[PDB]
Design a protein around this ligand. Structure first.
Ligand SMILES: CC(C)[C@H](NS(=O)(=O)c1cccc2nsnc12)P(=O)(O)C[C@H](C(=O)O)c1cccc(CN)c1
Ligand SMILES: [Zn+2]
Length: 304
């Protein structure tokens, strides 16, 4: 019961990750980088023509449970990658020279919760000591300026930074994988909604990254490319000044690990529907986003 033009529940996404791997065993392999608080496998797909010691780009979706278009996009990306490999020259070059690590849904427990009990949930669903309030904000749970500006120490708050950095099994798993694979990963892309933005470091402080001038030009070019299809307008810049400070983010943590091309995407829209983006907009949203991801990928290959 899977569709690329509808939002799919976790049972369906899980089945899809196995399906797309089985159909394309020579281009895709699947692993589980860990388990969620509730015991669900956290899947990662490795998309590319297999080879020794290839560079890689890492992309995840579904950090935040309610941001359903994010999850939708990782699925769209994988189909497009397989469908156009061997057919379109650029994607064919891409998957020959590098690997894509695609993590379709990080916060699986929260996503299940938005389908069963509360469409507007954001955090994980781990329990907290001493309170009935549930969950930690995964994008405040990484070891980058942890629990300083833009995060809450209150477990009942939506930006609760957690009992400690990487306290959540899900974020521990992601950080672990990246650490173990640091030599290969040239870029980190993390998909959110909404607001139509491309963000880069820093978010935990107002200081600018060493390669600020390069990241700004790249984001500028990427939003230009995105707009070419349907005229969708993105803003861009350092996280802290471009939206608000948010310490403990995975893009900042990836960057300070040495991954110099680290971007957060905020997809459609700009508040008309917000997180409840109509299914009729999924295809158009994913198509234009593909153009930006491919632009950044082509850039990375030329700047290894
Ligand atoms: C609507 C977008 C902007 C989400 N922010 S939100 O907390 O859900 C939110 C929704 C509605 C109104 C709001 N006012 S302030 N935050 C709001 P986000 O969750 O995707 C933003 C993301 C985060 O808060 O983790 C983010 C903010 C700043 C910087 C970065 C990159 N590290 C990421
Ligand atoms: Zn988000």
């Amino acid at each position: 019961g899977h569709s690329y033009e509808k939002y799919n529940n976790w049972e369906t996404i899980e089945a899809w990750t196995k399906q797309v791997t089985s159909e394309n065993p020579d281009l895709i392999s699947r692993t589980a980088i860990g388990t969620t608080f509730l015991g669900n496998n956290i899947y990662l797909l490795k998309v590319g023509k297999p080879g020794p010691n290839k560079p890689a780009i890492f992309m995840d979706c579904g950090f935040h449970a309610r941001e359903w278009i994010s999850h939708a996009f990782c699925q769209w990306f994988v189909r497009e990658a397989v469908l156009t490999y061997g057919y379109e020259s650029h994607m064919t070059e891409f998957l020959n020279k590098l690997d894509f690590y695609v993590l379709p849904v990080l916060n699986i427990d929260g996503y299940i919760y938005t389908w069963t009990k509360n469409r507007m949930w954001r955090k994980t669903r781990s329990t907290n000591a001493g309170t009935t309030c549930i969950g930690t904000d995964p994008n405040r749970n990484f070891d980058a300026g942890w629990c300083t500006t833009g995060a809450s120490t209150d477990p009942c708050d939506e930006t609760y930074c957690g009992s400690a950095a990487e306290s959540e099994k899900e974020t521990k798993a992601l950080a672990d994988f990246i650490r173990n694979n640091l030599s290969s990963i040239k870029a980190y892309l993390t998909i959110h909604s909404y607001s139509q933005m491309i963000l880069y470091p820093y978010s935990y402080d107002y200081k600018l990254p060493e390669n600020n001038a390069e990241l700004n030009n790249l984001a500028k070019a990427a939003v230009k490319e995105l707009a070419t299809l349907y005229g969708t307008k993105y803003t861009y810049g350092p996280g802290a000044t471009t939206i608000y400070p948010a310490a403990g983010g995975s893009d900042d943590w990836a960057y300070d690990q040495g991954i110099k091309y680290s971007f957060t995407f905020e997809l459609r829209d700009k508040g008309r529907y917000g997180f409840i983006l109509p299914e009729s907009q999924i295809q158009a949203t994913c198509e234009e986003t593909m153009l930006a991801i491919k632009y950044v990928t082509n850039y990375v290959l030329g700047h290894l």
